[PDB]
Ligand binder design. Sequence first.
Ligand code: HEC
Ligand code: HEM
Ligand code: HEM
Ligand code: HEM
Lengths: 56, 386, 57, 58, 117, 39, 64, 24, 52, 14, 243, 70
Amino acid sequence: MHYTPHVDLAFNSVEHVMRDVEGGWLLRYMHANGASMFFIVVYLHIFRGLYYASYS
Amino acid sequence: IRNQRFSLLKEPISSTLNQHLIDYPTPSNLSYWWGFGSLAGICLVIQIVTGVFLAMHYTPHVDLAFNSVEHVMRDVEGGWLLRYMHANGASMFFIVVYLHIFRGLYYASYSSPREFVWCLGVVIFLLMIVTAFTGYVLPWGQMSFWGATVITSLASAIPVVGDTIVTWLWGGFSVDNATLNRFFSLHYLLPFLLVGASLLHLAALHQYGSNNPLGVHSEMDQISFYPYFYVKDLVGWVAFAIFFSIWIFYAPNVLGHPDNYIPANPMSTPPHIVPEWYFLPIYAILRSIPDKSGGVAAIALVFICLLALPFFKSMYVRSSSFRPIYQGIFWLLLADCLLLGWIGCQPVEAPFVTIGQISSFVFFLFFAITPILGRVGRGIPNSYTT
Amino acid sequence: WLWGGFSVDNATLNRFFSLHYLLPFLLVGASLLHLAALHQYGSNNPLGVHSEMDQIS
Amino acid sequence: GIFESLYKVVMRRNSVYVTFVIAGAFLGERAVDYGIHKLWEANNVGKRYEDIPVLGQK
Amino acid sequence: QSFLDPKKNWLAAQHMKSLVKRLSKYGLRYDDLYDPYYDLDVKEALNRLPKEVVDARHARLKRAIDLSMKHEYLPEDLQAMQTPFRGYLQDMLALVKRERAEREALGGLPLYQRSIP
Amino acid sequence: FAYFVLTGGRFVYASLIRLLVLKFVLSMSASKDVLALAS
Amino acid sequence: PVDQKRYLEESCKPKCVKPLLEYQACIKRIHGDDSGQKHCTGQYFDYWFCVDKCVAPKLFTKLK
Amino acid sequence: DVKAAAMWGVAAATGGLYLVQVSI
Amino acid sequence: TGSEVRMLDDDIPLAQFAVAFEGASWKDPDSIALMVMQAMLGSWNKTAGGGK
Amino acid sequence: PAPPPPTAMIYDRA
Amino acid sequence: DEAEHGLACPSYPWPHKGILSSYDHASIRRGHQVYTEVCASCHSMSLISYRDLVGVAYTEEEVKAMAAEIEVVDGPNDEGEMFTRPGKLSDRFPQPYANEAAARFANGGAYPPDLSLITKARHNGQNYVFSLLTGYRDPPAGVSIREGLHYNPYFPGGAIAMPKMLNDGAVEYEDGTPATEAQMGKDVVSFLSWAAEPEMEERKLMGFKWIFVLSLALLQAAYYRRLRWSVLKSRKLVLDVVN
Amino acid sequence: KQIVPVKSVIYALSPFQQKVMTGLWKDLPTKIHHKVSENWISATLLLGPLVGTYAYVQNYLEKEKLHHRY
Ligand code: HEC
Ligand code: HEM
Ligand code: HEM
Ligand code: HEM
């Protein structure tokens, strides 16, 4: 809702989200760190499946 | 029977697909008017694919939206075909949805068992209206910008929170870059909500079964869907493809508005601000009664009437083929809807405003006369009994 | 063809944005199929043994 | 006769039928393109880009 | 009712004539249009109806559906022999409705409820 | 005769599917602007 | 180089005799205005619409 | 069958050459 | 001529159907091959000792 | 022809 | 209401109108010449590049020379300053004015609109543009137009701020064809129609092909549906019921 | 949703043993007569308000235009 995909405006738009948008920094940090935790949880999912041989 | 493997359709990997698309029993007497649901699904898929391939060359910025659209038209190989397909297919999607709705109205495909199907259809109609509105705002043309401004200004009709709601929706004090980005995100998001709603629509109908032109209980004479209704649907798809190619390759901008090719100028205003042709009945219902909160209430009443249509009782005779009075009422309703749509593309002069006031009254008279007729005709068998 | 040109540029950025918006919904569908396929036979247990005897809602 | 013999030849096997379908689609598209191009050139005579009287006199 | 009687009202007489013509084309009675899935009172009435009557209704419905699929009507002789409005369901439907009404009036619980779709 | 009528229809459908797929792919491919800027 | 459009518009006057006469009558009746608020734009538009309808096919027939 | 697999491979190659159309 | 006759009753406990192609004449040399094809499509019965 | 009397067919009689 | 709505424009037999009709590329070239001669001093076409004219109205060498005879600004050099260099094939058409404010100031408060999509941005685009160009005539008796504004019946409102620029002999065509007002108007409208819709020829060819092919598909699909439904639509049903 | 059984005898012919598209353009005058006669009331009701309203609007606009002609 506040990201501009142009080459000259993507970085400026992300910084605008961080600074000007009310609570936008929370959205940006939550999206990035939630991608991180999504991969953490998926790796734990895969490793638990490997341990208990849930692929039988 | 389950001891060893049989036809792979019955296997669990394809069991649901088989049961809902191949072996599903449907009435054998379905006309060509029943292919419009599948045709609308095809139109929705076409819109999703074409939009996904357009978003790779569209920049949602006030200084780059129109230039990006023109870049798609000219520089992108096949981009003119892509955008023409997208716009004209939104038009055909609304066309086939209107045909779907009016066929349901004629054959009373909503009355007792398909009330949830009709309600899901109304929700789908709301989602399509919102998605098409945002998508039309996306190119950032003169007409697009001013239609967005006016239609969002309708939101300033709730007596308490109207101004707050419209200011929050605008992203500011006027339609600007924030509104463009907001509408782009919403216009991308909603079609997937539309897909989910369409899946729920199909499942809810498949719970009971498709209605037939006779309106009678159709379970003694039913046929499998695939070998017999895939070919009829294929005929419908090819005819729609001919129509769609006709409207793309030869009359691309006829359905569109010429003012949308003028870059959006907030300072100036077009002489006549009119929405897309498929919002014209709603716009005419809005402008019929002179008010703003009154017009929003009228639109809400229209949608409430559509939602409450299936919940009327004593509609024992379903199909309009066996109801002369209801058939006449339906044809008058269709004429009224066409006249209302024509009025919506006209100024607010005296004859136009008078006819719009009359047309909305007839539109609601349809939704009252139908329960009145059902209650009156509930006692038909005792009176004509021989 | 993936770059949409000769180097990573505005075309690549826009295409990647469209794909990044689209894919998580395909991810939603794939996860729904994941759950539906699991529910066909059940869920494994730390013992790995047959577990249709002591089962709770 | 002719239809039955052709049916035998191009539908004894489904793979052969699919290959014939692809080949016929290609050939029919080429023939339709050729015919439509001839019609277009016959209709639009003297208006083509190569038909401009001046092309290198600038 | 006064205006619904074809004898006292010309508009009702024309409506009855048109309805008879429409029903006789597909050769099914008026009560065949009633849907068991609609009210479930029709379902209970058909459950209480004799097997011969139910089978005849199903045969008439199948014939009408087949005729609609074929885009054709009954021949002239069968249309002449067609006798719509010869009721078989109205009396039992009224009885079921009366039983439901008295059950509702005297507290009670519905013998059957339409499942939420 | 019926199979060959269906075969002609399949000629038509295959042509349409092929051209639609190629149109989408080449639309996602490079554009005239970047092609000309290459020089 | 004389204008084909002007020549054919001059040649289409007989086809639009009635609108031209109506416009001339409007001018004659309106002559003598006090301050303003009076014009013959309707008759002007009718006459020139008739002339334009008369002139287009011949116009692009003569034009190359 | 070996012959069936070979004919299906030929059909797939023909379809690929119809789609991509390298040197027609 | 390819055709079908369906006599649905649902009053009989069991359903009996027969689907048949066109065979060969008595003197047709392929008649013996048709008998062999019948043999490799042999009959099965619920009370048959062969079982499965 | 004429419609059958209400005492001609089995379903009508029932 | 008539004056504010504007005079309706007649339907013209354009050379590029029809199912199998293409642009008159000679007329496209003449229209481009007259545009760059007597129309680029006020109007701009920012959506049209020079490379668009290659293979349509001019050869590649001609377009290269035409782009080289103009100077456009380029980005910062090694010294960080802005410089000007002769244009190239991919350069857009030059803008006569610096910006919209300069255009309005120079044209007496009126902004000359972009001509890239002018035939698509007006209802009845081609005929309207032709009539507006070649329809500067005396106002009807009764209406007075202010100084600095010229009367054009086809312009919405009656009064237009654009002086009559299409006068006989304004542009000397290289073809030797007469420089008539109507001829130059037709050439201008053809060039603008090409600029707004450069894909018309390919679009019409593809549309004709797919309409014919899909009509054949509709015939085959009807045959297929009737063949599949042949068993159902040609069956006898015995039901043991008469009324 | 369960299929109801009906005692019937059905005779059906193979799709390749009978004509396919010949029955389409057969009895066309009779088909057209049925379409016209069975639906003339519906066509009148659909196109009645439209044509009458269009004529009324055109007459009103013409009357106003000549009234404001000075
Ligand atoms: C400078 C004197 C100009 C030249 C040379 C041309 N045009 Fe023009 N044009 C000019 C102005 C100042 C305006 C604005 C008028 C207004 O009141 O908005 C215009 C406008 C147009 C339009 C728009 C008409 C409309 O209804 O919006 C068109 C289509 C147009 N001009 C076309 C045009 C052409 C084709 C020219 C080459 C012959 C041309 N103009 C030259 C100023 C000037
Ligand atoms: C997620 C999928 C979709 C995406 C990414 C998308 C994206 C876009 C974009 C970028 C445009 C502007 C480009 C142009 O019009 O040339 C547009 C226009 C439009 N879209 Fe969508 N869209 C999608 C789905 C839909 C759907 C489902 C509808 C119909 C409800 C729709 C209706 C429209 C309309 C009416 C326009 C205006 C076309 C015009 O006249 O310019 N879009 N869309
Ligand atoms: C996204 C648009 C829509 C799609 C894809 C869609 C899809 C479908 C499909 C596939 C069917 C089953 C096939 C059929 O019976 O025609 C169907 C049936 C139906 N739809 Fe929709 N639909 C859409 C919009 C609507 C709307 C807006 C309504 C109005 C409430 C509606 C009401 C119905 C009804 C009542 C049926 C039952 C048909 C019958 O039994 O006669 N649909 N739809
Ligand atoms: C989008 C990310 C994913 C989601 C949302 C997801 C979701 C789920 C859910 C809801 C279950 C059932 C509850 C449970 O964990 O026991 C499940 C089970 C399972 N998932 Fe996933 N999953 C994801 C990724 C993966 C991946 C990457 C794999 C690796 C192949 C995987 C393999 C499994 C297996 C083997 C089970 C069975 C658990 C067992 O019975 O032991 N999942 N998943």
